[PDB]
Amino acid sequence: HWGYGKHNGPEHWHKDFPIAKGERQSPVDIDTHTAKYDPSLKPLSVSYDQATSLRILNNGHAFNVEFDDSQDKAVLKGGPLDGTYRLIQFHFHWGSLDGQGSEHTVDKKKYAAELHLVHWNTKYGDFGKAVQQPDGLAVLGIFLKVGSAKPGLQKVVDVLDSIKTKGKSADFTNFDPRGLLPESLDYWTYPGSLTTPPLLECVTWIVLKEPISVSSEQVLKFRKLNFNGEGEPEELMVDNWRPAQPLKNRQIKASFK
């Protein structure tokens, strides 16, 4: 099955998921000089005050912090979006070395990691029906650079020892995702896809310009997770990023001058 190694990595995924070579795949390189400012973009609204986390799960590809999405809590709206998108989970993609890890790049620059806060369009009723629609998802993408620690991330780092291997989960209540946000909500936006199989083309990407800073110790703890299950040969969970894909017939728009 699919993964990030030599024999099952991104260059292989198209054989089980032909949409890998589709018309709106993600990630992409953001060429800052050609992303035009769009003064019709409305401002972005991130309302996370009532977010209710439940659990953290090592899925053998990344870890997911999962939210109760059964009520109208933790919503993203405004910016490029029509209507309201509900937070369901967040996860990260990261490298084996600080020089690589992000999925989107900015003028070919790779950041050490990238956070994806995944939201579904509430007009479609739940996540499963939303990923059958071209405007079913909105992903807020946030870059991480290594410098000062992010205090808001430490509760995640500290729980990773309890979900080292594929299939492990842990209770993870009362985590506040506002502590993972940078100061500015200036962003780039474009239509794209999940960056992991099944690579579905459902996503309005909203990629923040301002990275957050995490410490070298915080990211080193991500790199101690495992892709394998318990009792299997150890394969460190590193380099779980897909490289940039062809932009094709797409324009990237900037929310800021």
Ligand SMILES: Cc1cccc(S)c1
């Ligand atoms: C499940 C899911 C949703 C959105 C983006 C990614 S990379 C994955």
Ligand SMILES: [Zn+2]
């Ligand atoms: Zn992702």
